[PDB]
Amino acid sequence: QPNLVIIMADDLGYGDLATYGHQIVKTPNIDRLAQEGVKFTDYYAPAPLSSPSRAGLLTGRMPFRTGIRSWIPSGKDVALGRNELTIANLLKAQGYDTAMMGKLHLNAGGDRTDQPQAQDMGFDYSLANTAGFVTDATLDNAKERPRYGMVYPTGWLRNGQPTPRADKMSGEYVSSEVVNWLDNKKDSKPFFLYVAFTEVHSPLASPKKYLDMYSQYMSAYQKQHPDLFYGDWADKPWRGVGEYYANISYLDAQVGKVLDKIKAMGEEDNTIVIFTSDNGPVTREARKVYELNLAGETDGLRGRKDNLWEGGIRVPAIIKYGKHLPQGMVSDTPVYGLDWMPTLAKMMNFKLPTDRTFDGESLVPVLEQKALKREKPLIFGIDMPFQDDPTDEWAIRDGDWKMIIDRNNKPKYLYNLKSDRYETLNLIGKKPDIEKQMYGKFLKYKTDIDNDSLMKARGDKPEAVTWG
Amino acid sequence: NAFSPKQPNLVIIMADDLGYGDLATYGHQIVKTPNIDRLAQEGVKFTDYYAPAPLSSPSRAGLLTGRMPFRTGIRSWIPSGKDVALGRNELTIANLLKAQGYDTAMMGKLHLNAGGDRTDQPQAQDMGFDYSLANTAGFVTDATLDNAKERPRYGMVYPTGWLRNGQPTPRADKMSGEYVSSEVVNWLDNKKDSKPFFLYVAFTEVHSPLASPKKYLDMYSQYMSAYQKQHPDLFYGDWADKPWRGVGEYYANISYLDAQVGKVLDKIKAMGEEDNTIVIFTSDNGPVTREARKVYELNLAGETDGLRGRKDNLWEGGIRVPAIIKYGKHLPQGMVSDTPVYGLDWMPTLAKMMNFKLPTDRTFDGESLVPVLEQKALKREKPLIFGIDMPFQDDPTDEWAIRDGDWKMIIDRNNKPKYLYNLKSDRYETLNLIGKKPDIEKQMYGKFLKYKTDIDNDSLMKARGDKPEAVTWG
Ligand code: NA
Ligand code: NA
Ligand code: NA
């Protein structure tokens, strides 16, 4: 009965790792992970934003089914559906020691008794940030302007209980917790770790070591003001790209610390490791005041975080399982976050519930070097109103064809991705019969999603996002 | 109960799609621009200079006439076979200097008419240039690659279809930057008179298609993808279905431009004209970034120093571009100015610097920058005005922007305010103040509508029998 470790990076772009082609950043640990496992070049997140993507991946269900369509606003009634089951829920029922450390972002806050929390979601141990980003209260509530100091996480909960201000930056705070929990394991029970790193989401916080690696990529202003709090960046000169790269290398190091602990404890050959990201990056294209001075890369792919174009949804993914998988295999088979649930059911020898719809397919055939026969197209969504450039709402991927649907059920884009990698040759009005086939397939999938039985069972309905 | 019953020479060097962040002297952390960095070191560098528009043709029309480009009949792109061109009665800096007795010449990108064959439209000669080697198009074509039968196609781009004094040329034996710089150098050699000169050197770099010699590609080998290294001369017409090339080819093209600017500047100095030549180096609009919107925009890497938007956009990154002026030792050397200035300012600035008078029969939008160069404060009597008429875009573009002090308002294509920013507190345009600043909103929208009416009812436009024509072509 194999252990499972799912390592989730935050806003990590498709081109943000050396093994995915980044020409500057040093990511030795994740690069080695890819060499020892299977790396996917055509893997997608279920959504181009944190909350629906994470909900999708943990449930095996298109996020709209689970009640999460985009951001989760403070004080409102948006959370993961009460009757939803996560990988953790199912593995607990198989007799697993379950734990999560880091970003949760599946409810409106840790103090909400009317909403599922980490334990309800199947994690028997948790060090959790319920929010979408790291806060340091000592920087937020500081009186002077400008504010100087590196960001140290406040407001996290260990097993539902308040914690002191961290004495490590977020990545180390997460990884030390993971290593400690593994150090203090009671028995020989199989474990499931969900290591949800907050890197590379704003606010970036990196130790000097990683910062020094990219001093060429810092602006003169950054060098004069390296500790400048991001809350004070709106009216300041550009910082360059080095702080972003530093943060990537810091993440890499903390991933390495988790992987080194698995190997040291004698569990390499018994542990399934999945490394992925929840959505495409924040690039140089900042849309919000909390998005400044970042430098995510998409390997040329169109769009970024928020967007249903490739660079918003295509993300790194690597799977390793001791010596049981082909080492250093690279797969270009189209796969996505919703596939993990059936994959792990098969790999870990548990049955999926049959009282609910799952959207994904087992990837075991891909790992076994066989064809993947996919019955359904890949389906993506985001419900993000009030954007300066209006977002689209749905995307469907079927073979080489990809259709993007606007916030009014109208096809806005149609691409053949094999002849148009960068989504610059819109085929709407040019391919009438492919248009009708793809639109028909969209309506059938949308209808199935909107009429989801499990969502009906909890007295819920698809609710359009009306909030910001 | 209620119900009871010796005149100075002029060289204007215009780069194409060169971004605000694209030069080392503007903070680029990778690219080597020794010649342009030196120009800034020897001159006045503006950090808050704007092009008149976020697209080639209206920007260039604006700069050359001192008039907001819509007044001149150019609102965005110039398609072939249509009637979009610089208005017939418009005068450029070249027309004015021709009448002062200048030897006037133009080399490189024109992009102010629908083609060199169009006898119904003003050409380079009509615009006041007595000598020209011109590309009338918005981009370089190499017919040999365009017409090649094999797919994919391999070969570096050599300019075809350029006109020397109205006449066809053979395919260039040098890539565009060198084709231009060589023409400039030869013209400066072959001239006989001691008449003052005006050179408009309109480089095609860094516009797609990129074309750079091996020397410059080698400078950036680290920044080339594995695929690029295996397929270095792959033709850009065949990039749509191929792996990313990395960012090295873009940097190479920047350094190539820099060397060609250097060649021209070296010639000015070598012929003994450094002390008596005004040199303006600028760009026509913001860059094409990693944010590709079109099949001809792939594998590019323009930088905006973090500023919002890019080419096409009215946000800072689409209109703020590099600008350097040098005039021998007549100007403060190594000066850096953060006074907001723009392309429409050049006409009255040069009128003062070069001692000619502006025509009194037409509206001009800019103001003389002589006070800035004399290290005094500049007071504007008009807002800075920008526009672009670009329909059918995937993310709809906005149409106007006005700038007054630290305040910037962007107007959508339905004539409605969409954004209001204080650039002093919000460099990155992320804090929209629409519905948060009632007095400022009223002041700025009022200033806009006044400026819009004045532009729409331009007298010179009326004099040639024209009107503002909304862009309905693609
Ligand atoms: Na995220
Ligand atoms: Na955009
Ligand atoms: Na241009």
mmCIF file of N, CA, C and O in Angstrom, chain A residues 125-158:
data_model
loop_
_atom_site.group_PDB
_atom_site.id
_atom_site.type_symbol
_atom_site.label_atom_id
_atom_site.label_comp_id
_atom_site.label_asym_id
_atom_site.label_seq_id
_atom_site.Cartn_x
_atom_site.Cartn_y
_atom_site.Cartn_z
ATOM 1 N N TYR A 125 -3.980 15.770 10.149
ATOM 2 C CA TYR A 125 -3.040 16.791 10.606
ATOM 3 C C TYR A 125 -3.011 17.926 9.578
ATOM 4 O O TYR A 125 -2.963 17.660 8.376
ATOM 5 N N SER A 126 -3.023 19.176 10.043
ATOM 6 C CA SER A 126 -2.858 20.330 9.134
ATOM 7 C C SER A 126 -2.113 21.556 9.684
ATOM 8 O O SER A 126 -2.405 22.012 10.786
ATOM 9 N N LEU A 127 -1.144 22.075 8.922
ATOM 10 C CA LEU A 127 -0.651 23.450 9.132
ATOM 11 C C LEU A 127 -1.115 24.295 7.941
ATOM 12 O O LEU A 127 -0.498 24.273 6.871
ATOM 13 N N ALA A 128 -2.195 25.037 8.141
ATOM 14 C CA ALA A 128 -2.946 25.623 7.027
ATOM 15 C C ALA A 128 -3.024 27.144 6.993
ATOM 16 O O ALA A 128 -3.274 27.784 8.015
ATOM 17 N N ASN A 129 -2.815 27.707 5.801
ATOM 18 C CA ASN A 129 -3.247 29.063 5.477
ATOM 19 C C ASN A 129 -4.552 28.923 4.695
ATOM 20 O O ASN A 129 -4.554 28.416 3.577
ATOM 21 N N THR A 130 -5.671 29.346 5.279
ATOM 22 C CA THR A 130 -6.960 29.229 4.587
ATOM 23 C C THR A 130 -7.136 30.258 3.455
ATOM 24 O O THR A 130 -8.033 30.124 2.613
ATOM 25 N N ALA A 131 -6.252 31.254 3.428
ATOM 26 C CA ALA A 131 -6.349 32.366 2.490
ATOM 27 C C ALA A 131 -5.534 32.107 1.212
ATOM 28 O O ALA A 131 -4.687 31.204 1.166
ATOM 29 N N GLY A 132 -5.778 32.921 0.188
ATOM 30 C CA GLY A 132 -5.116 32.758 -1.117
ATOM 31 C C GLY A 132 -3.675 33.239 -1.240
ATOM 32 O O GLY A 132 -3.044 33.055 -2.282
ATOM 33 N N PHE A 133 -3.150 33.850 -0.179
ATOM 34 C CA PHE A 133 -1.835 34.481 -0.184
ATOM 35 C C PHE A 133 -1.300 34.565 1.249
ATOM 36 O O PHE A 133 -2.067 34.472 2.212
ATOM 37 N N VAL A 134 0.011 34.736 1.376
ATOM 38 C CA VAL A 134 0.652 34.869 2.685
ATOM 39 C C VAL A 134 0.560 36.304 3.206
ATOM 40 O O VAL A 134 0.789 37.262 2.474
ATOM 41 N N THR A 135 0.197 36.427 4.478
ATOM 42 C CA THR A 135 0.136 37.707 5.179
ATOM 43 C C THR A 135 1.183 37.694 6.282
ATOM 44 O O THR A 135 1.416 36.655 6.914
ATOM 45 N N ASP A 136 1.853 38.830 6.466
ATOM 46 C CA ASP A 136 2.619 39.115 7.679
ATOM 47 C C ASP A 136 1.920 40.308 8.336
ATOM 48 O O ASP A 136 1.960 41.425 7.804
ATOM 49 N N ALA A 137 1.266 40.059 9.474
ATOM 50 C CA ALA A 137 0.531 41.104 10.197
ATOM 51 C C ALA A 137 1.436 42.223 10.725
ATOM 52 O O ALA A 137 1.015 43.373 10.792
ATOM 53 N N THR A 138 2.687 41.898 11.050
ATOM 54 C CA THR A 138 3.637 42.911 11.529
ATOM 55 C C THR A 138 4.100 43.878 10.433
ATOM 56 O O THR A 138 4.580 44.974 10.732
ATOM 57 N N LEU A 139 3.974 43.463 9.174
ATOM 58 C CA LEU A 139 4.222 44.368 8.055
ATOM 59 C C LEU A 139 2.954 45.108 7.648
ATOM 60 O O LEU A 139 2.998 46.306 7.391
ATOM 61 N N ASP A 140 1.824 44.410 7.599
ATOM 62 C CA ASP A 140 0.535 45.043 7.282
ATOM 63 C C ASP A 140 0.176 46.170 8.251
ATOM 64 O O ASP A 140 -0.255 47.240 7.830
ATOM 65 N N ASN A 141 0.365 45.916 9.545
ATOM 66 C CA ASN A 141 -0.007 46.873 10.590
ATOM 67 C C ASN A 141 1.114 47.837 11.007
ATOM 68 O O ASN A 141 0.940 48.616 11.952
ATOM 69 N N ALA A 142 2.254 47.778 10.313
ATOM 70 C CA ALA A 142 3.362 48.715 10.544
ATOM 71 C C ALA A 142 2.950 50.135 10.146
ATOM 72 O O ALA A 142 2.194 50.318 9.191
ATOM 73 N N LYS A 143 3.433 51.131 10.892
ATOM 74 C CA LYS A 143 2.929 52.508 10.765
ATOM 75 C C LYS A 143 3.734 53.375 9.792
ATOM 76 O O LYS A 143 3.170 54.233 9.110
ATOM 77 N N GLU A 144 5.043 53.139 9.736
ATOM 78 C CA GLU A 144 5.956 53.905 8.891
ATOM 79 C C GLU A 144 5.714 53.633 7.403
ATOM 80 O O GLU A 144 5.151 52.596 7.047
ATOM 81 N N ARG A 145 6.104 54.585 6.557
ATOM 82 C CA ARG A 145 6.059 54.431 5.096
ATOM 83 C C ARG A 145 7.345 55.004 4.506
ATOM 84 O O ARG A 145 7.662 56.171 4.747
ATOM 85 N N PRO A 146 8.107 54.193 3.743
ATOM 86 C CA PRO A 146 7.863 52.805 3.334
ATOM 87 C C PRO A 146 8.218 51.771 4.416
ATOM 88 O O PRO A 146 8.873 52.109 5.410
ATOM 89 N N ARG A 147 7.773 50.530 4.215
ATOM 90 C CA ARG A 147 8.034 49.435 5.154
ATOM 91 C C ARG A 147 9.106 48.516 4.627
ATOM 92 O O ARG A 147 9.110 48.145 3.452
ATOM 93 N N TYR A 148 10.023 48.154 5.509
ATOM 94 C CA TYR A 148 11.110 47.268 5.149
ATOM 95 C C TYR A 148 11.091 46.012 5.999
ATOM 96 O O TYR A 148 10.896 46.062 7.218
ATOM 97 N N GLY A 149 11.271 44.881 5.336
ATOM 98 C CA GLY A 149 11.348 43.609 6.013
ATOM 99 C C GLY A 149 10.816 42.507 5.138
ATOM 100 O O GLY A 149 9.872 42.701 4.350
ATOM 101 N N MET A 150 11.436 41.347 5.281
ATOM 102 C CA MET A 150 10.997 40.146 4.597
ATOM 103 C C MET A 150 9.715 39.606 5.253
ATOM 104 O O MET A 150 9.454 39.863 6.436
ATOM 105 N N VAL A 151 8.906 38.894 4.467
ATOM 106 C CA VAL A 151 7.570 38.469 4.878
ATOM 107 C C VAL A 151 7.609 37.113 5.603
ATOM 108 O O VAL A 151 8.111 36.125 5.065
ATOM 109 N N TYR A 152 7.090 37.096 6.836
ATOM 110 C CA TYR A 152 7.029 35.896 7.675
ATOM 111 C C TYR A 152 5.567 35.626 8.028
ATOM 112 O O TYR A 152 4.917 36.482 8.631
ATOM 113 N N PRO A 153 5.037 34.446 7.639
ATOM 114 C CA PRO A 153 3.608 34.123 7.724
ATOM 115 C C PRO A 153 2.995 34.242 9.120
ATOM 116 O O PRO A 153 3.528 33.690 10.091
ATOM 117 N N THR A 154 1.885 34.969 9.193
ATOM 118 C CA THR A 154 1.057 35.025 10.390
ATOM 119 C C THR A 154 -0.325 34.464 10.056
ATOM 120 O O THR A 154 -0.703 34.375 8.881
ATOM 121 N N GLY A 155 -1.068 34.063 11.081
ATOM 122 C CA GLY A 155 -2.459 33.673 10.906
ATOM 123 C C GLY A 155 -2.690 32.238 10.468
ATOM 124 O O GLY A 155 -3.816 31.863 10.148
ATOM 125 N N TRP A 156 -1.634 31.428 10.445
ATOM 126 C CA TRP A 156 -1.789 30.029 10.036
ATOM 127 C C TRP A 156 -2.323 29.237 11.218
ATOM 128 O O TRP A 156 -2.167 29.646 12.373
ATOM 129 N N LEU A 157 -2.977 28.121 10.921
ATOM 130 C CA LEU A 157 -3.570 27.286 11.955
ATOM 131 C C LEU A 157 -2.901 25.925 11.971
ATOM 132 O O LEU A 157 -2.784 25.284 10.929
ATOM 133 N N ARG A 158 -2.438 25.490 13.142
ATOM 134 C CA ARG A 158 -2.006 24.109 13.300
ATOM 135 C C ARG A 158 -3.128 23.343 13.986
ATOM 136 O O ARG A 158 -3.447 23.606 15.152
#
